[PDB]
Amino acid sequence: TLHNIITDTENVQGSFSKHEFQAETKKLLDIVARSLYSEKEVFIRELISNGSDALEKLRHRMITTAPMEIHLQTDSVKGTFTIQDTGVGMNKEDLVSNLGTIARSGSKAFLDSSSIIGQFGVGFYSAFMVADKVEVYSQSAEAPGYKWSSDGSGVFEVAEASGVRQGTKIVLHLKDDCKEFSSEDRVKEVVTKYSNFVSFPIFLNGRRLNTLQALWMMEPKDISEWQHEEFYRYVAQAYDKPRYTLHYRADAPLNIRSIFYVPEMKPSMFDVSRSVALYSRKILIQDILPKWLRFLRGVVDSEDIPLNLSRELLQESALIRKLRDVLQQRVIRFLLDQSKKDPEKYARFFEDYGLFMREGIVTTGEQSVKEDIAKLLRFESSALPAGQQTSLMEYSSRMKAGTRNIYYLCAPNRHLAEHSPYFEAMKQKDMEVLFCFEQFDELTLLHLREFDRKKLISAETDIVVDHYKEEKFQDSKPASERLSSEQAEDLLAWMRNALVQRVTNIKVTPRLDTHPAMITVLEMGAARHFLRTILQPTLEINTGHDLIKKLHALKDSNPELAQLLLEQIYDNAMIAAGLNEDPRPMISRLNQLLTRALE
Amino acid sequence: TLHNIITDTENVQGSFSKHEFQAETKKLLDIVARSLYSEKEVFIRELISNGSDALEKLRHRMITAGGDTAPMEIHLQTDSVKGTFTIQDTGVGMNKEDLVSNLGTIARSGSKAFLDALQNQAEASSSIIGQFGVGFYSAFMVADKVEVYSQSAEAPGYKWSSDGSGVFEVAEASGVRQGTKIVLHLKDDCKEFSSEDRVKEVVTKYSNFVSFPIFLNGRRLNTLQALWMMEPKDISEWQHEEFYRYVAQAYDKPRYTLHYRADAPLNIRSIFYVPEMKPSMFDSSVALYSRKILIQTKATDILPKWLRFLRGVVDSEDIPLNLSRELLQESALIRKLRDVLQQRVIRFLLDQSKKDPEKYARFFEDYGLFMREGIVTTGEQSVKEDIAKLLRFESSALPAGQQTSLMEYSSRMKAGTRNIYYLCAPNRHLAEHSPYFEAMKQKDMEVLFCFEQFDELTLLHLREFDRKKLISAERLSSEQAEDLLAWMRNALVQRVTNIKVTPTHPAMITVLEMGAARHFLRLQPTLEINTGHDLIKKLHALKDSNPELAQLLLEQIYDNAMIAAGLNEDPRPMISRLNQLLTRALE
Ligand SMILES: Nc1ncnc2c1ncn2[C@@H]1O[C@H](COP(=O)(O)OP(=O)(O)OP(=O)(O)O)[C@@H](O)[C@H]1O
Ligand SMILES: Nc1ncnc2c1ncn2[C@@H]1O[C@H](COP(=O)(O)OP(=O)(O)O)[C@@H](O)[C@H]1O
Ligand SMILES: [Co+2]
Ligand SMILES: [Co+2]
Ligand SMILES: [Co+2]
Ligand SMILES: [Co+2]
């Protein structure tokens, strides 16, 4: 039933010849020039890094004055890119060894700090992506200037040159394909993109470039609020200022140097339907954050993320997942700390960004992550004054020992919640009820399902499950102000005839006071969400209510007006339940009822 | 104020000394083994691709040599006790010379030299995957020891073995089957590749559409056919639906299918799907392949951003690949492909609106936000008007629910008409009663009614379409009303500031500026009263007789008009008060 050809049948015969790996050098040069880097512009990043390393070496040799800088020159008339650094330079041996040998890195044998970028020994050859001819003038410290020249076809020549300034100058005779790198504006774009945090001054055609400090690598105390505003505007390409700043450093289990910002501007709803930069040794390298935290701006840097040869890919997908989980938990802890510090400011944050907390809860499969994010949610309570926000953890700490459920109610505003027909039935019990006003709060709590091993249950659902338990409820009005059992059952029989296929059951409830009726569905939250795109509703009436009392008299007094009224009582309860369809078609019927009621 | 040190001051003194470029082979071996890819699991994709190429070379030789139609298979075996991963193909194999040359030399590609000598039309020219010469070394990322047994089809078997540290060994071996067998002794941290389920995940991810059958521990894996390589007619509708669910990881059906084949600027065999299900807040896309091997599960450079709602596959045998085989090189051919594909999809969707306008109306309802996003995002005015051909709006000349396009409108204009006008309103009731729509109606003419979100932002960025700019268009006696008017103006001073009289519904709400209406749905309405309605003449009578009932009645007339104007879709705040009004009315 299985088809396998792999069997241990091979046996070594005689001696073995030992060999050594070889390399096709000319083929390797073509690979680096045509297939290594996915974008041609990164040759500027490679040459600047080499200039930075050469300067870092000279700075190290200054322990035993001279200017230490990088100069870029573009000539559109001759189509040349030129970079010159004032670093250690290279002698006759170093030019042949370092530049002539692929994968040979002098920056490897130099050790023996953490300010060197090169390690692979191939980055220099990126110049042959954009240039047909490359000239290198190098003058070593102490040390006879030499000129290195090649075309990238597998051969180079070296001759002694005079008048070579200390350091190294490299001239790229650009191909006709890549004349854009003889443009000053284009070259300045690439420098700002990849090399904006170099530790040495960079000059472009005589003008000094506005390099920045890598704030994420600095001590948080040495960073002012003004410095964070400037950095936020650069990394987020924004014009405002951050309302929250998280500067997170860690060394275990992973190296982390990061800064996250929350914009003071509210998120654009156009951009929400359609964020953080990753760096290494202060060079841009472009997953890191969960989807629901995409509203964060800033920078993440981790020495534990290996880069591929082209310096544009991350190699440890298991570490990125682990990094993302660490960052996620650190942001949750930070946001909770903002709630306790300034709850008024956090109330505006949750109002502008709370939608991301709800998305994260709905789209996550891990229950512990759902509950971690749910700690950020804020609601009102029936046990607290109006306007005072609370949380699920604060609700849990008020629960008695004998309770195992968290009750909530979803209504547009505080007044509708306090005077809801579903909260009137809950007042007969002595449980606290969360008041949730946001449009997607019910969907969120439905996906959350439980918090701290306590089941979430809506007021509407609990009212229906009480029907299948004990009738432990008393009417808010004495029996003298309600219909008798003969009168109520006579009314219920008429209602079932006038509302055949519209309702499943009609019953009298002793749990209402101000409202004449209500609609109950066991899975009310799921019905309200499905309506965002004829079910089996139950109509529960208040026989103590004057409007219901008048309905019983109208079915014999004015039978046609009584049916018109019954339809409006049903519609009012459907609207109040959040289960109404289009409210426009009922306005025509309601105006007809108002004229007839007013004689 | 300038400071430049770059000056032409160098002059060569002496003679040149010529040298050839070198390679530090031991360091380079390490670079190509672990520094090329983003995932170490890639060694499985590389070794299966190499075995496919060996099988392809064997199939090509048999066109002339005429073998016997050997099995031609790829077999994988895992051993979780010894920690080994084994792959064997029944392909063309390698003698001792080819083992030392191909395996021992970095960037040496025998498949590349095979491709160069083939006739450019031969079948094997478009299906051989190798070219770089480094893919095999990815095994040393996951293995401390690599052994290769190979038997060529000529005349002796050989064993090639190495640890990946500069040297390798070659010896004669007996019992070596025709083809190549590679045994990887997995490192401790890469033991997962000795697990059957893990190997099956990698094969499915990258090599699911390899031509030749693939066996794992005696069980077949690649059962799916590359549908994009077939003739569009020879593909039935049920095959597209089943292939769509696989490529899109979906569970519905495609509402639109575009099977696109072309040869310029690149060879392209592609299949695009539009899902039948709407996008949701809780949330793959078009994958890129090359010679049946996955390059990117989410292609980035081939389609514009606004077409990210499309699902499916694009395969190109000659697109310039990055060394990592998970990226594309920067190429003018790839930039032209994106423009060709953009025009192709636009044309396809335009043909669907002619083929089935009702079905296209449902499509534009679900995915119109991507058309609108495309017009705002792109910078070329020519592609703005191309995407604008897909836009649909309502009109004042057509009844409600009927749609028209910008081209399906520039025709019905008058002869001397260089302008076209639109009105972005929440709904039709507000648009038909907009004071600016009356002005655009007195001078004949017709206004587009735009109700969708960002419809205003779309037409503003559109500026001009079809060489024509888009310019926004922005019984009760004789005088018993003022006694009711001034009473109505006073009872709701905080809601409206203008209450008029206009000759079913007792009253209606109108809004002056439409920009203020959408701000309210996230203003100053004009309550227009009719003197002839019963509730209005009843409100005038109850005004002084029953003041409590008159206040509840006025509030209900106001709220009912707000509902009829679409400015109140959740009438929950009124239910309790309406119940009090009904009770006091039926005394
Ligand atoms: N501007 C320079 N001045 C002095 N020495 C240099 C300069 N550029 C390169 N070198 C030397 O030549 C060597 C060639 O480096 P190459 O750019 O090929 O790779 P790398 O920078 O060592 O490593 P990577 O490939 O990771 O960038 C370097 O190790 C360095 O020692
Ligand atoms: N069965 C086989 N498995 C792997 N390589 C083989 C096989 N038969 C022949 N070869 C040769 O080994 C060479 C090494 O290829 P590799 O280093 O992976 O780079 P590429 O695949 O791009 O040529 C191939 O070009 C191919 O000619
Ligand atoms: Co054995
Ligand atoms: Co307690
Ligand atoms: Co000169
Ligand atoms: Co040819």
Of the candidates A3, A14, A101, the beta carbon closest to that of B22 is on A101
Mutual orientation of helices A317-341 and A343-363 as an angle, nearest 10°? 150
Which atom of ligand 1 is closest in space to residue A46's alpha carbon?
A: 27
Looking up tokens 């509402």 gives B255
Of the candidates A13, A100, A203, the beta carbon closest to that of B173 is on A13
What is the distance between the alpha carbons of residues B209 and B200, in angstroms, rounded to a whole number?
13
Distance (Å) from CA A426 to ligand 4 centroid: 21
* CA B483 centroid distance within chain: 62
Residues of A in contact with B506 (CB under 8 A): 591
What is the distance between the alpha carbons of residues B272 and B267, in angstroms, rounded to a whole number?
16
On whether B135 is known to bind a ligand per the annotation, the reply is: yes
Are residues B331 and B243 in contact, defined by beta-carbon separation less than 8 angstroms? no
β-pairing verdict for B293-296 and B287-290:
antiparallel
Tell whether ligand 1 has an atom less than 6 A from the beta carbon of residue A382. no
Tell whether ligand 2 has an atom less than 6 A from the beta carbon of residue B135. yes
Evaluate the CA torsion angle A124, A130, A136, A140 in order and state its sign. negative
Question: Does the CB of B20 have a partner CB in chain A at under 8 Å?
Answer: yes
Secondary structure in 3-state letters for A342-404: CHHHHHHHHHHHHHHHHHHHHHCCCHHHHHHHHCCCCEEECCCCCCCCECHHHHHHHCCCCCC
CA distance A70 to chain B (A): 9
Q: What is the resolution of the experimental data for this entry, in Å?
A: 2.5
What is the distance between the alpha carbons of residues A200 and A58, in angstroms, rounded to a whole number?
12
Question: Pseudo-torsion of CA B39, B41, B47, B49, nearest 10°?
Answer: -60
Question: Does the CB of A162 have a partner CB in chain B at under 8 Å?
Answer: yes
Tell whether ligand 2 has an atom less than 6 A from the beta carbon of residue B109. yes
| Minimum Cα–Cα distance from B458: chain A residue | A270
Which among B220, B221, B225 has a CA at the least distance from the CA of B202?
B221
CB contact under 8 A, A163 and B9: yes
Number of CB atoms found within 10 A of residue B185's CB: 17
Distance (Å) from CA A204 to ligand 1 centroid: 21
**Residues paired with B168 in a beta bridge:** A19, B162
Phi and psi angles of residue B167, each rounded to the nearest 5 degrees, phi first: -130, 160
The burial of A561, by beta-carbon neighbours within 10 Å (0-12 exposed, 13-18 middle, 19 or more buried), is given as middle
Q: How far apart are the first and last CA of chain A?
A: 88
Which B residues 171-200 touch A at CB under 8 Å?
171-177, 181
Of the candidates A2, A31, A159, the beta carbon closest to that of B14 is on A159
Which among A574, A411, A407 has a CA at the least distance from the CA of A502?
A574
What is the distance between the alpha carbons of residues B206 and B214, in angstroms, rounded to a whole number?
13
The widest CA-to-CA distance across chain B, in whole angstroms, is 119
What distances in angstroms separate CA B25 from CA A30, B107, B145, one per listed residue?
Answer: 17, 11, 18
Phi and psi angles of residue B121, each rounded to the nearest 5 degrees, phi first: -95, -15
Ligand 1 pocket test: which of A32, A50, A93, A120 has the largest number of ligand atoms within 8 Å of its C-beta? A50
Of the candidates A154, A516, A588, the beta carbon closest to that of B579 is on A516
Tell whether ligand 2 has an atom less than 6 A from the beta carbon of residue B91. yes
Residue ranges with strand state E in A116-204 = 131-139, 145-150, 155-162, 167-174, 202-204
Which atom of ligand 1 is closest in space to residue A102's alpha carbon?
A: 18
Protein residues within 5 Å, CB atom, of ion ligand 6: B 120
Distance (Å) from CA B63 to ligand 6 centroid: 19
H helix intervals, B209-317: 237-248
CB contact under 8 A, A28 and B107: yes
Which A residues 512-531 touch B at CB under 8 Å?
514-516
What is the distance between the alpha carbons of residues B252 and A3, in angstroms, rounded to a whole number?
35
Report DSSP letters for A40-92, one per residue.
GGGHHHHHHHHHHHHHHHHHHHTT------EEEEEETTTTEEEEEE-S----H
Q: How was this structure determined?
A: X-ray
Question: Which phi-psi region, left, alpha or beta, contains residue B276 (left: φ > 0; alpha: ψ -120 to 50)?
Answer: alpha
Question: Does the CB of A284 have a partner CB in chain B at under 8 Å?
Answer: no
Tell whether ligand 1 has an atom less than 6 A from the beta carbon of residue A121. yes
Secondary structure in 3-state letters for A267-280: CCHHHHHCCEEEEE
Ligand 1 pocket test: which of A61, A98, A117 has the largest number of ligand atoms within 8 Å of its C-beta? A98
Helix (H) or strand (E) holding A7: none
Are residues B473 and B437 in contact, defined by beta-carbon separation less than 8 angstroms? yes
Residue nearest to atom 12 of ligand 1 (CA): A98
Tell whether ligand 2 has an atom less than 6 A from the beta carbon of residue B396. no
Which atom of ligand 2 is closest in space to residue B131's alpha carbon?
A: 22
Pick among A37, A69, A308 to test the B interface (most B CBs inside 10 A): A308
Contact partners, residue A255, CB within 8 Å, separation at least 6 = A302, A303, A304
Beginning with the edge strand found earlier in the chain, give each strand of the sheet holding B268-275 in spatial order. B254-262, B268-275, B311-315, B287-290, B293-296
What is the distance between the alpha carbons of residues A32 and A562, in angstroms, rounded to a whole number?
87
Helix (H) or strand (E) holding B274: strand B268-275
CB contact under 8 A, A40 and B330: yes
CB contact under 8 A, A25 and B20: yes
On whether B136 is known to bind a ligand per the annotation, the reply is: yes
Report DSSP letters for B320-379, one per residue.
-B-TTSSSB---HHHHHHHHHHHHHHHHHHHHHHHH-HHHHHHHHHHHHHHHHHHHHH--
Tell whether ligand 1 has an atom less than 6 A from the beta carbon of residue A124. yes
A211-226: b or e for each residue (b if 16 or more CB lie within 10 Å)? beebbbeeeeeebeee
Looking up tokens 């209504």 gives A411
Residues of B in contact with A169 (CB under 8 A): 6, 10
Q: What CATH code is carried by the domain that includes residue B394? A: 3.40.50.11260
CB contact under 8 A, A359 and B172: no
On whether A227 is known to bind a ligand per the annotation, the reply is: no
Question: Does the CB of A137 have a partner CB in chain B at under 8 Å?
Answer: yes
| Minimum Cα–Cα distance from A122: chain B residue | B28
B115: helix, strand or coil: helix
Q: Which amino acid is at A372?
A: D
Using omega within 30 degrees of 0 as the cis cutoff, is the peptide bond preceding B265 cis? Answer: yes
A176-194: b or e for each residue (b if 16 or more CB lie within 10 Å)? eebebbbeeeebbebbeeb
CA distance B236 to chain A (A): 32
Q: Which domain covers residue A437, as residue numbers?
A: 341-458
Contact partners, residue B486, CB within 8 Å, separation at least 6 = none
Looking up tokens 């930039």 gives B335
Helix (H) or strand (E) holding B575: helix B572-585
What is the distance between the alpha carbons of residues A150 and B368, in angstroms, rounded to a whole number?
55
CB contact under 8 A, A38 and B217: no
Question: 3-state SS of chain A: helix, strand, coil percent to 5?
Answer: 45, 20, 35
Tokens of B294: 């996955």
Beginning with the edge strand found earlier in the chain, give each strand of the sheet holding B214-216 in spatial order. A11-20, B167-174, B157-162, B143-151, B179-186, B84-89, B74-79, B214-216, B219-220
